Amino acid sequence: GSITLRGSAEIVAEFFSFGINSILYQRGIYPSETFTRVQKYGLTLLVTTDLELIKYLNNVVEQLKDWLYKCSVQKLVVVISNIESGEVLERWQFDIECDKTAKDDSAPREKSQKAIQDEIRSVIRQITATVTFLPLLEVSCSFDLLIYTDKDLVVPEKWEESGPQFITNSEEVRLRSFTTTIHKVNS
């Protein structure tokens, strides 16, 4: 599924986190009864407080909040595979798009573009929509987050040679492998 999590430096950071936390809440190959109801983007939203997976997204969210660019860079690919069904299984691909670039007269105010409410609401809607339609499944699987850029981000080892890489294998945590990679792209 290819989607576009665009908006603005701040809205983008949130767009990805909420969209990413959604895949976990909707799919969650091994979440916990700790979700949280949050009302934003003009509607209600759900998220997980799993510190473990959060620790992973937390470090990435920090880099996302300020990797080291300010122009292009804006592509992501989530790779999830079923370790107990048929290998690959789900792939949430979402790109980003920054508009109205600027720095002066910043100020913490702007109001997310109406399209953000509809665009972001439609995202969480399609994720949670299939979930209910899903025959309550999960099994053990692998999870990897990718960040595709456009010749505008040379994240050095500052991350970890390629984002973190956690793994699992407990007869209850399902899941099996978790990772995050920064991919580079040209036009």
UniProtKB/Swiss-Prot annotation:
Consequence of substituting residue 162 to A: Reduces phosphorylation on serine residues. Abolishes phosphorylation on serine residues
Coiled coil: none
Effect after changing residue 178 to A: Prevents formation of the closed conformation and interaction with CDC20
Recorded consequence of changing residue 67 to A: Prevents interaction with CDC20 and leads to formation of the closed conformation
In-chain residues carrying the UniProt-annotated modification Phosphoserine: 122, 162, 170, 177, 187
Xref: InterPro entries: HORMA_dom, HORMA_dom_sf, Mad2-like
Effect on the protein upon substituting residue 145 to A: Leads to formation of the closed conformation
Compartments it resides in: Nucleus; Chromosome, Centromere, Kinetochore; Cytoplasm; Cytoplasm, Cytoskeleton, Spindle pole
GO annotation, biological process: cell division; establishment of centrosome localization; establishment of mitotic spindle orientation; mitotic sister chromatid segregation; mitotic spindle assembly checkpoint signaling; negative regulation of mitotic cell cycle; negative regulation of protein catabolic process; negative regulation of ubiquitin protein ligase activity
Molecular function GO labels: identical protein binding; protein homodimerization activity
HORMA domain mapped to chain residues: 6-187
Coarse class of the protein's main subcellular location: nucleus
Keywords annotated in UniProt: Acetylation, Cell cycle, Cell division, Centromere, Chromosome, Cytoplasm, Cytoskeleton, Kinetochore, Mitosis, Nucleus, Phosphoprotein
Listed GO CC annotations: cytoplasm; cytosol; kinetochore; mitotic checkpoint complex; mitotic spindle; mitotic spindle assembly checkpoint MAD1-MAD2 complex; nuclear pore nuclear basket; nucleoplasm
A Pfam family of this chain: HORMA
Impact upon substituting residue 187 to A: Abolishes phosphorylation on serine residues
PROSITE patterns documented for this protein: HORMA
Assembly: Monomer and homodimer. Heterodimerizes with MAD2L1 in order to form a tetrameric MAD1L1-MAD2L1 core complex. In the closed and open conformation, interacts with MAD1L1. Formation of a heterotetrameric core complex containing two molecules each of MAD1L1 and of MAD2L1 promotes binding of another molecule of MAD2L1 to each MAD2L1, resulting in a heterohexamer. Interacts with MAD2L1BP. Interacts with ADAM17/TACE. Interacts with CDC20. Dimeric MAD2L1 in the closed conformation interacts with CDC20. Monomeric MAD2L1 in the open conformation does not interact with CDC20.
Function: Component of the spindle-assembly checkpoint that prevents the onset of anaphase until all chromosomes are properly aligned at the metaphase plate. In the closed conformation (C-MAD2) forms a heterotetrameric complex with MAD1L1 at unattached kinetochores during prometaphase, the complex recruits open conformation molecules of MAD2L1 (O-MAD2) and then promotes the conversion of O-MAD2 to C-MAD2.
Family stated for the protein in its record: Belongs to the MAD2 family.
Domain note: The protein has two highly different native conformations, an inactive open conformation that cannot bind CDC20 and that predominates in cytosolic monomers, and an active closed conformation. The protein in the closed conformation preferentially dimerizes with another molecule in the open conformation, but can also form a dimer with a molecule in the closed conformation.
Name used for this protein in its record: Mitotic spindle assembly checkpoint protein MAD2A
